[PDB]
Symmetry: D2
Subunit: 122 residues, 4 copies
Amino acid sequence: RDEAGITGTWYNQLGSTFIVTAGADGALTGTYESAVGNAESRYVLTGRYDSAPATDGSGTALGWTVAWKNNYRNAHSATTWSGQYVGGAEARINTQWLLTSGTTEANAWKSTLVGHDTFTKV
Amino acid sequence: RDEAGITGTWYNQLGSTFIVTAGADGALTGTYESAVGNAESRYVLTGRYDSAPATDGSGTALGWTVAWKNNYRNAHSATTWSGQYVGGAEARINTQWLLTSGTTEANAWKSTLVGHDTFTKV
Amino acid sequence: RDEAGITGTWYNQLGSTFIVTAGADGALTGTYESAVGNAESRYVLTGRYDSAPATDGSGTALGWTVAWKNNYRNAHSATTWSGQYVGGAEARINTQWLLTSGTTEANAWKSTLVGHDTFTKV
Amino acid sequence: RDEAGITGTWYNQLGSTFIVTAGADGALTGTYESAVGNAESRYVLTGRYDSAPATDGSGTALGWTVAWKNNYRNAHSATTWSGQYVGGAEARINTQWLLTSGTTEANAWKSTLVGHDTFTKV
Ligand SMILES: [Cu+2]
Ligand SMILES: [Cu+2]
Ligand SMILES: [Cu+2]
Ligand SMILES: [Cu+2]
Protein backbone atom coordinates (compact mmCIF):
# COMPACT_ATOMS: atom_id res chain seq x y z
CA ARG A 1 0.00 0.00 0.00
CA ASP A 2 1.26 3.30 -1.32
CA GLU A 3 -1.57 5.29 0.19
CA ALA A 4 0.95 7.50 1.93
CA GLY A 5 3.41 7.51 -1.06
CA ILE A 6 0.66 8.65 -3.48
CA THR A 7 -1.10 11.21 -1.37
CA GLY A 8 0.23 14.74 -1.86
CA THR A 9 1.29 17.21 -4.52
CA TRP A 10 2.83 16.19 -7.81
CA TYR A 11 4.25 18.16 -10.74
CA ASN A 12 4.68 17.08 -14.36
CA GLN A 13 7.05 18.09 -17.17
CA LEU A 14 4.66 20.76 -18.43
CA GLY A 15 4.52 22.48 -15.07
CA SER A 16 1.06 21.18 -14.21
CA THR A 17 0.16 20.36 -10.57
CA PHE A 18 -1.83 17.30 -9.43
CA ILE A 19 -2.97 17.28 -5.75
CA VAL A 20 -4.34 13.94 -4.64
CA THR A 21 -5.53 11.93 -1.65
CA ALA A 22 -5.35 8.17 -1.82
CA GLY A 23 -7.99 6.30 0.27
CA ALA A 24 -7.28 2.92 2.01
CA ASP A 25 -9.85 1.27 -0.35
CA GLY A 26 -8.32 2.43 -3.66
CA ALA A 27 -9.96 5.84 -4.08
CA LEU A 28 -8.14 8.83 -5.61
CA THR A 29 -9.59 12.31 -5.11
CA GLY A 30 -8.24 15.78 -5.61
CA THR A 31 -7.56 18.60 -7.99
CA TYR A 32 -5.60 19.21 -11.15
CA GLU A 33 -4.23 22.44 -12.55
CA SER A 34 -2.89 22.40 -16.10
CA ALA A 35 -0.11 24.66 -17.20
CA VAL A 36 -1.30 24.33 -20.83
CA GLY A 37 -4.43 24.27 -22.92
CA ASN A 38 -7.92 25.68 -22.38
CA ALA A 39 -7.76 25.56 -18.62
CA GLU A 40 -7.56 27.85 -15.69
CA SER A 41 -7.27 27.23 -11.95
CA ARG A 42 -8.22 23.87 -10.37
CA TYR A 43 -10.47 21.09 -11.70
CA VAL A 44 -11.87 18.13 -9.80
CA LEU A 45 -10.30 14.80 -10.35
CA THR A 46 -11.22 11.35 -9.37
CA GLY A 47 -9.72 7.94 -9.89
CA ARG A 48 -8.57 4.57 -8.55
CA TYR A 49 -5.29 2.82 -7.64
CA ASP A 50 -4.28 -0.75 -6.72
CA SER A 51 -4.20 -0.59 -2.91
CA ALA A 52 -2.47 -4.00 -2.61
CA PRO A 53 0.26 -4.05 -5.27
CA ALA A 54 2.66 -6.88 -6.01
CA THR A 55 5.71 -7.01 -3.69
CA ASP A 56 8.13 -8.03 -6.46
CA GLY A 57 9.42 -4.52 -7.28
CA SER A 58 6.50 -3.75 -9.63
CA GLY A 59 4.96 -0.32 -9.76
CA THR A 60 1.38 0.41 -8.50
CA ALA A 61 -1.26 0.77 -11.21
CA LEU A 62 -3.54 3.79 -11.07
CA GLY A 63 -5.64 6.16 -13.18
CA TRP A 64 -7.65 9.29 -12.87
CA THR A 65 -9.95 11.56 -14.86
CA VAL A 66 -10.43 15.31 -15.18
CA ALA A 67 -13.39 16.84 -17.02
CA TRP A 68 -12.31 20.30 -18.05
CA LYS A 69 -15.25 22.20 -16.60
CA ASN A 70 -14.93 24.32 -13.49
CA ASN A 71 -16.39 27.69 -12.44
CA TYR A 72 -14.02 29.62 -14.80
CA ARG A 73 -14.11 27.64 -18.05
CA ASN A 74 -15.56 24.72 -19.90
CA ALA A 75 -13.32 23.18 -22.55
CA HIS A 76 -15.88 20.39 -23.37
CA SER A 77 -13.29 17.69 -22.86
CA ALA A 78 -11.97 15.09 -20.48
CA THR A 79 -8.52 13.64 -19.91
CA THR A 80 -7.75 10.26 -18.36
CA TRP A 81 -4.29 9.32 -17.18
CA SER A 82 -3.41 5.70 -16.85
CA GLY A 83 -0.07 4.69 -15.41
CA GLN A 84 1.95 3.52 -12.45
CA TYR A 85 3.39 4.92 -9.25
CA VAL A 86 7.03 3.94 -8.66
CA GLY A 87 8.17 4.55 -5.01
CA GLY A 88 11.72 5.19 -3.63
CA ALA A 89 14.19 8.05 -3.52
CA GLU A 90 13.06 9.60 -6.82
CA ALA A 91 9.27 8.64 -6.62
CA ARG A 92 7.34 9.06 -9.88
CA ILE A 93 4.01 8.57 -11.44
CA ASN A 94 4.56 7.57 -15.12
CA THR A 95 1.48 7.99 -17.19
CA GLN A 96 -0.05 7.91 -20.63
CA TRP A 97 -3.19 9.98 -21.25
CA LEU A 98 -6.17 10.29 -23.60
CA LEU A 99 -7.86 13.69 -23.99
CA THR A 100 -11.27 13.39 -25.72
CA SER A 101 -13.19 16.52 -26.74
CA GLY A 102 -16.90 16.50 -27.38
CA THR A 103 -17.31 16.69 -31.20
CA THR A 104 -19.93 16.30 -33.87
CA GLU A 105 -20.02 12.84 -35.42
CA ALA A 106 -18.29 14.27 -38.59
CA ASN A 107 -15.32 15.34 -36.44
CA ALA A 108 -15.20 12.26 -34.15
CA TRP A 109 -12.09 10.99 -36.00
CA LYS A 110 -10.15 14.01 -34.54
CA SER A 111 -11.67 13.95 -31.07
CA THR A 112 -8.86 12.33 -29.13
CA LEU A 113 -5.33 13.42 -28.23
CA VAL A 114 -2.77 11.01 -26.73
CA GLY A 115 0.34 11.87 -24.75
CA HIS A 116 2.47 10.95 -21.78
CA ASP A 117 3.15 12.83 -18.50
CA THR A 118 5.71 12.07 -15.80
CA PHE A 119 4.95 13.38 -12.31
CA THR A 120 7.50 13.97 -9.60
CA LYS A 121 7.33 15.29 -6.04
CA VAL A 122 9.67 18.26 -6.79
CA ARG B 1 -26.88 18.06 -19.25
CA ASP B 2 -26.94 14.35 -19.97
CA GLU B 3 -27.12 13.38 -16.33
CA ALA B 4 -30.24 11.36 -17.06
CA GLY B 5 -28.95 10.09 -20.48
CA ILE B 6 -25.70 8.79 -18.92
CA THR B 7 -27.02 7.26 -15.75
CA GLY B 8 -27.86 3.56 -16.09
CA THR B 9 -26.55 0.31 -17.48
CA TRP B 10 -24.37 0.08 -20.56
CA TYR B 11 -22.93 -2.84 -22.53
CA ASN B 12 -19.91 -2.92 -24.81
CA GLN B 13 -18.90 -5.07 -27.80
CA LEU B 14 -17.06 -7.55 -25.59
CA GLY B 15 -20.13 -8.20 -23.47
CA SER B 16 -18.89 -6.15 -20.52
CA THR B 17 -21.39 -4.19 -18.36
CA PHE B 18 -20.83 -0.66 -17.02
CA ILE B 19 -23.37 0.60 -14.41
CA VAL B 20 -23.07 4.29 -13.70
CA THR B 21 -24.67 7.24 -11.92
CA ALA B 22 -23.99 10.71 -13.21
CA GLY B 23 -24.12 13.51 -10.57
CA ALA B 24 -25.39 17.07 -11.34
CA ASP B 25 -21.83 18.39 -10.70
CA GLY B 26 -19.98 16.11 -13.16
CA ALA B 27 -19.37 13.03 -10.99
CA LEU B 28 -19.48 9.48 -12.37
CA THR B 29 -19.75 6.57 -9.92
CA GLY B 30 -20.58 2.93 -10.31
CA THR B 31 -19.38 -0.53 -11.16
CA TYR B 32 -17.79 -2.32 -14.07
CA GLU B 33 -17.83 -6.00 -14.93
CA SER B 34 -15.49 -7.19 -17.68
CA ALA B 35 -16.34 -10.10 -19.88
CA VAL B 36 -12.61 -10.62 -20.60
CA GLY B 37 -9.25 -10.63 -18.90
CA ASN B 38 -8.18 -11.24 -15.31
CA ALA B 39 -11.42 -10.08 -13.79
CA GLU B 40 -14.39 -11.44 -11.99
CA SER B 41 -17.60 -9.84 -10.73
CA ARG B 42 -17.90 -6.06 -10.17
CA TYR B 43 -15.17 -3.44 -9.65
CA VAL B 44 -15.59 0.12 -8.45
CA LEU B 45 -15.36 2.85 -10.97
CA THR B 46 -15.16 6.54 -10.73
CA GLY B 47 -14.91 9.36 -13.20
CA ARG B 48 -16.07 12.74 -14.53
CA TYR B 49 -18.21 14.10 -17.40
CA ASP B 50 -18.90 17.57 -18.85
CA SER B 51 -22.20 18.49 -17.17
CA ALA B 52 -22.76 21.50 -19.46
CA PRO B 53 -21.88 20.35 -22.98
CA ALA B 54 -21.98 22.41 -26.16
CA THR B 55 -25.47 22.68 -27.74
CA ASP B 56 -24.18 22.46 -31.31
CA GLY B 57 -24.72 18.70 -31.78
CA SER B 58 -21.38 17.79 -30.15
CA GLY B 59 -21.06 14.77 -27.92
CA THR B 60 -20.45 15.03 -24.12
CA ALA B 61 -16.88 14.36 -22.99
CA LEU B 62 -16.34 11.92 -20.15
CA GLY B 63 -13.89 9.43 -18.64
CA TRP B 64 -13.65 6.90 -15.91
CA THR B 65 -11.19 4.57 -14.22
CA VAL B 66 -11.29 1.01 -12.89
CA ALA B 67 -8.49 -0.46 -10.77
CA TRP B 68 -8.74 -4.20 -11.16
CA LYS B 69 -8.80 -5.09 -7.49
CA ASN B 70 -11.95 -6.26 -5.76
CA ASN B 71 -12.66 -8.90 -3.09
CA TYR B 72 -12.17 -11.79 -5.62
CA ARG B 73 -9.04 -10.83 -7.56
CA ASN B 74 -6.26 -8.36 -7.99
CA ALA B 75 -4.89 -8.03 -11.52
CA HIS B 76 -2.44 -5.20 -10.51
CA SER B 77 -3.74 -2.93 -13.24
CA ALA B 78 -5.98 -0.02 -14.02
CA THR B 79 -7.97 0.94 -17.11
CA THR B 80 -9.11 4.45 -18.02
CA TRP B 81 -11.70 5.09 -20.69
CA SER B 82 -11.82 8.46 -22.31
CA GLY B 83 -14.57 9.26 -24.78
CA GLN B 84 -17.90 10.88 -25.49
CA TYR B 85 -21.57 10.22 -24.88
CA VAL B 86 -23.74 10.71 -27.98
CA GLY B 87 -27.51 10.98 -27.13
CA GLY B 88 -30.58 10.18 -29.34
CA ALA B 89 -32.39 7.10 -30.57
CA GLU B 90 -29.29 4.89 -30.65
CA ALA B 91 -27.38 6.48 -27.62
CA ARG B 92 -23.71 5.47 -27.33
CA ILE B 93 -20.63 6.05 -25.35
CA ASN B 94 -17.63 5.86 -27.76
CA THR B 95 -14.38 5.38 -25.95
CA GLN B 96 -10.69 4.74 -26.23
CA TRP B 97 -8.92 3.13 -23.26
CA LEU B 98 -5.47 2.67 -21.70
CA LEU B 99 -4.86 -0.38 -19.48
CA THR B 100 -1.62 -0.02 -17.46
CA SER B 101 -0.30 -2.94 -15.40
CA GLY B 102 2.11 -2.50 -12.55
CA THR B 103 5.52 -3.69 -13.86
CA THR B 104 9.18 -3.64 -12.95
CA GLU B 105 11.11 -0.80 -14.56
CA ALA B 106 12.68 -3.34 -17.04
CA ASN B 107 9.18 -4.23 -18.28
CA ALA B 108 7.69 -0.69 -18.23
CA TRP B 109 7.90 -0.53 -22.06
CA LYS B 110 5.18 -3.29 -22.19
CA SER B 111 3.02 -1.99 -19.36
CA THR B 112 0.23 -0.38 -21.34
CA LEU B 113 -2.50 -1.75 -23.61
CA VAL B 114 -4.66 0.53 -25.78
CA GLY B 115 -8.05 -0.23 -27.28
CA HIS B 116 -11.49 1.13 -28.02
CA ASP B 117 -14.93 0.17 -26.59
CA THR B 118 -18.38 1.23 -27.76
CA PHE B 119 -21.17 1.11 -25.18
CA THR B 120 -24.84 0.89 -25.95
CA LYS B 121 -27.99 0.69 -23.84
CA VAL B 122 -29.04 -2.72 -25.31
CA ARG C 1 1.32 -15.77 -46.09
CA ASP C 2 -1.46 -13.31 -46.79
CA GLU C 3 0.40 -11.60 -49.59
CA ALA C 4 -2.54 -12.23 -51.88
CA GLY C 5 -5.18 -11.55 -49.13
CA ILE C 6 -3.63 -8.14 -48.30
CA THR C 7 -2.87 -6.87 -51.75
CA GLY C 8 -5.69 -4.77 -53.23
CA THR C 9 -8.12 -2.01 -52.40
CA TRP C 10 -9.54 -1.45 -48.94
CA TYR C 11 -12.12 0.98 -47.55
CA ASN C 12 -12.58 2.18 -43.98
CA GLN C 13 -15.56 3.47 -41.97
CA LEU C 14 -14.82 7.08 -42.90
CA GLY C 15 -14.94 6.34 -46.61
CA SER C 16 -11.17 6.47 -47.06
CA THR C 17 -9.45 4.18 -49.61
CA PHE C 18 -6.16 2.32 -49.03
CA ILE C 19 -4.58 0.65 -52.11
CA VAL C 20 -1.73 -1.66 -51.26
CA THR C 21 0.68 -4.26 -52.63
CA ALA C 22 2.16 -6.79 -50.27
CA GLY C 23 5.63 -8.13 -51.23
CA ALA C 24 6.77 -11.74 -50.53
CA ASP C 25 9.40 -10.35 -48.08
CA GLY C 26 7.03 -8.30 -45.89
CA ALA C 27 6.91 -5.01 -47.82
CA LEU C 28 3.74 -2.89 -48.07
CA THR C 29 3.57 -0.18 -50.74
CA GLY C 30 0.76 1.87 -52.16
CA THR C 31 -1.46 4.88 -51.82
CA TYR C 32 -3.94 6.28 -49.36
CA GLU C 33 -6.80 8.70 -49.94
CA SER C 34 -8.51 10.16 -46.88
CA ALA C 35 -12.13 11.11 -46.91
CA VAL C 36 -11.50 13.54 -44.01
CA GLY C 37 -9.03 16.11 -42.80
CA ASN C 38 -6.49 18.29 -44.59
CA ALA C 39 -5.99 15.94 -47.49
CA GLU C 40 -6.73 15.68 -51.13
CA SER C 41 -6.13 12.94 -53.69
CA ARG C 42 -3.56 10.15 -53.13
CA TYR C 43 -0.55 10.04 -50.78
CA VAL C 44 2.28 7.53 -50.78
CA LEU C 45 2.28 4.90 -48.14
CA THR C 46 4.77 2.39 -47.04
CA GLY C 47 4.87 -0.28 -44.39
CA ARG C 48 5.55 -3.87 -43.30
CA TYR C 49 3.56 -7.03 -42.49
CA ASP C 50 4.39 -10.44 -40.98
CA SER C 51 4.84 -12.61 -44.08
CA ALA C 52 4.86 -15.86 -42.05
CA PRO C 53 2.06 -15.54 -39.49
CA ALA C 54 1.08 -18.09 -36.86
CA THR C 55 -1.21 -20.88 -38.16
CA ASP C 56 -3.32 -21.02 -34.99
CA GLY C 57 -6.13 -18.73 -36.20
CA SER C 58 -4.26 -15.54 -35.23
CA GLY C 59 -4.43 -12.45 -37.38
CA THR C 60 -1.40 -11.11 -39.36
CA ALA C 61 0.36 -8.11 -37.83
CA LEU C 62 1.06 -5.13 -40.06
CA GLY C 63 1.54 -1.36 -40.10
CA TRP C 64 1.98 1.47 -42.49
CA THR C 65 2.71 5.19 -42.60
CA VAL C 66 1.42 8.14 -44.62
CA ALA C 67 3.08 11.57 -44.52
CA TRP C 68 0.44 14.04 -45.56
CA LYS C 69 2.42 15.77 -48.28
CA ASN C 70 1.68 15.25 -51.94
CA ASN C 71 1.65 17.56 -54.98
CA TYR C 72 -1.66 19.21 -53.87
CA ARG C 73 -1.21 19.82 -50.14
CA ASN C 74 1.07 19.56 -47.18
CA ALA C 75 -0.64 19.08 -43.82
CA HIS C 76 2.74 18.80 -41.93
CA SER C 77 1.71 15.52 -40.35
CA ALA C 78 2.07 11.78 -40.52
CA THR C 79 -0.26 8.94 -39.58
CA THR C 80 0.80 5.39 -38.71
CA TRP C 81 -1.66 2.54 -38.56
CA SER C 82 -0.79 -0.50 -36.57
CA GLY C 83 -3.08 -3.51 -36.61
CA GLN C 84 -3.88 -6.93 -37.96
CA TYR C 85 -5.28 -8.50 -41.10
CA VAL C 86 -7.98 -11.12 -40.43
CA GLY C 87 -8.69 -13.35 -43.52
CA GLY C 88 -11.90 -15.29 -44.43
CA ALA C 89 -15.32 -14.50 -45.82
CA GLU C 90 -15.52 -11.02 -44.29
CA ALA C 91 -11.72 -10.11 -44.47
CA ARG C 92 -10.70 -7.06 -42.42
CA ILE C 93 -7.78 -5.01 -41.40
CA ASN C 94 -8.40 -3.77 -37.81
CA THR C 95 -6.18 -0.90 -36.89
CA GLN C 96 -5.32 1.73 -34.34
CA TRP C 97 -3.55 4.89 -35.55
CA LEU C 98 -1.42 7.79 -34.32
CA LEU C 99 -1.49 11.08 -36.27
CA THR C 100 1.39 13.39 -35.24
CA SER C 101 1.54 16.96 -36.56
CA GLY C 102 4.73 18.97 -36.62
CA THR C 103 4.42 21.51 -33.76
CA THR C 104 6.50 23.98 -31.81
CA GLU C 105 7.87 22.58 -28.56
CA ALA C 106 5.21 24.64 -26.62
CA ASN C 107 2.45 22.79 -28.50
CA ALA C 108 4.06 19.31 -28.49
CA TRP C 109 1.59 18.16 -25.79
CA LYS C 110 -1.23 18.49 -28.43
CA SER C 111 0.67 17.08 -31.38
CA THR C 112 -0.80 13.61 -31.53
CA LEU C 113 -4.27 12.26 -32.35
CA VAL C 114 -5.23 8.62 -31.73
CA GLY C 115 -8.04 6.66 -33.33
CA HIS C 116 -9.07 3.35 -34.82
CA ASP C 117 -10.00 2.40 -38.43
CA THR C 118 -11.50 -0.83 -39.73
CA PHE C 119 -10.87 -1.65 -43.39
CA THR C 120 -12.96 -3.96 -45.50
CA LYS C 121 -12.85 -5.09 -49.12
CA VAL C 122 -16.35 -3.66 -49.92
CA ARG D 1 14.12 19.65 -45.54
CA ASP D 2 15.70 17.59 -42.80
CA GLU D 3 16.86 14.88 -45.14
CA ALA D 4 20.39 15.31 -43.87
CA GLY D 5 19.28 15.89 -40.20
CA ILE D 6 17.22 12.65 -40.18
CA THR D 7 19.55 10.34 -42.01
CA GLY D 8 21.88 8.40 -39.69
CA THR D 9 21.95 6.43 -36.47
CA TRP D 10 19.64 7.12 -33.56
CA TYR D 11 19.36 5.65 -30.06
CA ASN D 12 16.37 5.61 -27.73
CA GLN D 13 15.96 5.45 -23.93
CA LEU D 14 15.77 1.66 -23.95
CA GLY D 15 19.10 1.33 -25.73
CA SER D 16 17.56 0.44 -29.09
CA THR D 17 19.23 1.61 -32.34
CA PHE D 18 17.39 2.98 -35.39
CA ILE D 19 19.48 3.42 -38.59
CA VAL D 20 17.69 5.37 -41.28
CA THR D 21 18.08 7.04 -44.67
CA ALA D 22 15.75 9.85 -45.58
CA GLY D 23 15.03 10.26 -49.34
CA ALA D 24 14.46 13.69 -51.01
CA ASP D 25 10.83 12.64 -51.75
CA GLY D 26 9.83 11.71 -48.17
CA ALA D 27 10.98 8.08 -48.00
CA LEU D 28 12.43 6.53 -44.83
CA THR D 29 14.33 3.24 -45.11
CA GLY D 30 16.62 1.36 -42.79
CA THR D 31 16.95 -1.01 -39.91
CA TYR D 32 15.89 -1.23 -36.30
CA GLU D 33 17.42 -3.20 -33.45
CA SER D 34 15.45 -3.43 -30.21
CA ALA D 35 17.14 -3.73 -26.89
CA VAL D 36 13.97 -5.31 -25.43
CA GLY D 37 11.27 -7.80 -26.25
CA ASN D 38 11.14 -10.79 -28.59
CA ALA D 39 13.74 -9.47 -30.98
CA GLU D 40 17.24 -10.14 -32.07
CA SER D 41 19.56 -8.38 -34.50
CA ARG D 42 18.25 -6.01 -37.22
CA TYR D 43 14.75 -5.74 -38.74
CA VAL D 44 13.74 -3.84 -41.85
CA LEU D 45 11.94 -0.61 -41.41
CA THR D 46 10.17 1.67 -43.74
CA GLY D 47 8.32 4.92 -43.40
CA ARG D 48 7.65 8.50 -44.50
CA TYR D 49 8.49 12.05 -43.35
CA ASP D 50 7.35 15.57 -44.34
CA SER D 51 10.12 16.66 -46.72
CA ALA D 52 8.93 20.30 -46.75
CA PRO D 53 8.11 21.19 -43.14
CA ALA D 54 6.81 24.50 -41.85
CA THR D 55 9.52 27.15 -41.29
CA ASP D 56 7.93 28.53 -38.12
CA GLY D 57 9.99 26.49 -35.62
CA SER D 58 7.70 23.44 -35.87
CA GLY D 59 9.09 19.94 -35.82
CA THR D 60 9.02 17.62 -38.89
CA ALA D 61 6.34 14.92 -38.84
CA LEU D 62 7.38 11.36 -39.59
CA GLY D 63 6.55 7.71 -38.95
CA TRP D 64 7.88 4.28 -39.60
CA THR D 65 6.99 0.62 -39.20
CA VAL D 66 8.86 -2.53 -38.19
CA ALA D 67 7.36 -6.01 -38.57
CA TRP D 68 9.17 -8.20 -36.10
CA LYS D 69 10.18 -10.94 -38.51
CA ASN D 70 13.75 -11.36 -39.68
CA ASN D 71 15.96 -14.40 -40.36
CA TYR D 72 16.41 -15.10 -36.59
CA ARG D 73 12.92 -14.69 -35.12
CA ASN D 74 9.31 -13.98 -35.80
CA ALA D 75 7.41 -12.29 -32.98
CA HIS D 76 4.15 -12.05 -35.07
CA SER D 77 3.87 -8.33 -34.42
CA ALA D 78 4.45 -4.91 -35.86
CA THR D 79 5.30 -1.57 -34.27
CA THR D 80 4.62 1.85 -35.79
CA TRP D 81 6.21 4.99 -34.44
CA SER D 82 4.58 8.29 -35.15
CA GLY D 83 6.27 11.50 -34.08
CA GLN D 84 8.39 14.48 -34.97
CA TYR D 85 12.02 15.30 -35.64
CA VAL D 86 13.25 18.41 -33.80
CA GLY D 87 16.59 19.76 -35.22
CA GLY D 88 19.31 21.87 -33.47
CA ALA D 89 22.08 21.30 -30.96
CA GLU D 90 20.31 18.47 -29.12
CA ALA D 91 18.38 16.94 -32.17
CA ARG D 92 15.63 14.46 -31.24
CA ILE D 93 12.95 12.33 -32.68
CA ASN D 94 10.02 12.28 -30.19
CA THR D 95 7.64 9.47 -30.84
CA GLN D 96 4.62 7.57 -29.67
CA TRP D 97 4.22 3.94 -30.82
CA LEU D 98 1.62 1.20 -31.25
CA LEU D 99 2.77 -2.45 -31.13
CA THR D 100 0.06 -4.82 -32.45
CA SER D 101 0.50 -8.59 -32.17
CA GLY D 102 -1.39 -11.03 -34.32
CA THR D 103 -4.07 -12.57 -32.06
CA THR D 104 -7.18 -14.69 -32.24
CA GLU D 105 -10.40 -12.67 -32.34
CA ALA D 106 -11.05 -13.63 -28.63
CA ASN D 107 -7.75 -11.96 -27.66
CA ALA D 108 -7.99 -8.93 -30.01
CA TRP D 109 -8.84 -6.67 -27.03
CA LYS D 110 -5.24 -7.27 -25.73
CA SER D 111 -3.46 -7.09 -29.07
CA THR D 112 -2.01 -3.61 -28.87
CA LEU D 113 0.65 -2.00 -26.68
CA VAL D 114 1.22 1.78 -26.63
CA GLY D 115 4.32 3.64 -25.52
CA HIS D 116 6.64 6.51 -26.26
CA ASP D 117 10.33 6.55 -27.36
CA THR D 118 12.73 9.47 -27.59
CA PHE D 119 15.65 9.11 -30.00
CA THR D 120 18.87 11.04 -29.83
CA LYS D 121 22.07 11.06 -31.87
CA VAL D 122 24.27 10.06 -28.86
CU1 LIG E 1 -0.43 -10.60 -6.58
CU1 LIG F 1 -19.33 26.28 -24.85
CU1 LIG G 1 5.36 -18.91 -34.70
CU1 LIG H 1 2.95 25.18 -44.74
